[PDB]
Amino acid sequence: EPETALLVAFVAYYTALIALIFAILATRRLC
Amino acid sequence: PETALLVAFVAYYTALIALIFAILATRR
Amino acid sequence: EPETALLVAFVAYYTALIALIFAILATRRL
């Protein structure tokens, strides 16, 4: 599957951005 | 291809772990 | 639970960046 690779990469790219912001929010919530 | 889809799945599961790790820190 | 969750937030931060890299690395294969 050639087109499926972009599907998982985009989901991974946005999910990692969601996890990136949550880590920023969790740091600034305690601190 | 399978070689690129495998790397995209690592990124996906690594993003899932980072997302779970973020939840564990929020609950505390 | 106290200052411990701060370090766990740092683990989530760098793990997400690693996921961002593999998402870009998987795009380079196309």
Decide if A15 touches C, using CB distance below 8 A.
yes
- Residue C19 and residue B14 in contact, taking contact as beta carbons nearer than 8 Å: yes
| Chains contacting C (3 or more CB pairs within 8 Å) | A, B
Cβ burial of C15 (10 Å; 0-12, 13-18, 19+) is: buried
CB-CB neighbours of A28 under 10 Å = 9
H runs (alpha helix) in chain C: 4-28
Q: Residue C13's domain spans which residues?
A: 1-30
Q: Return d(Cα C14, Cα C11) in angstroms, integer.
A: 5
Helices in B1-28 by DSSP H: which ranges?
2-27
The subunits that touch chain A, with at least 3 C-beta pairs less than 8 Å apart, are B, C
Contacting residues for C24 by C-beta, under 8 A, at least 6 apart: A9, A13
Question: CA dist C1 to A14, A28, B10, B21, C5, Å?
Answer: 28, 15, 29, 13, 6
To what resolution in angstroms was this structure determined? Answer: 3.5
Contacts of C5 (CB under 8 A, 6+ apart): A26, A30, B24, B25, B26, B27, B28
User: Alpha-carbon Rg of chain C, whole angstroms?
Assistant: 13
- Which of A6, A17, A21, A22 is most worth mutating to test chain B (most B CB atoms within 10 A of its CB)? A22
- What total of structural domains would you count in chain C? 1
C25 at the A interface (CB within 8 A)?
Answer: no
Method: X-ray
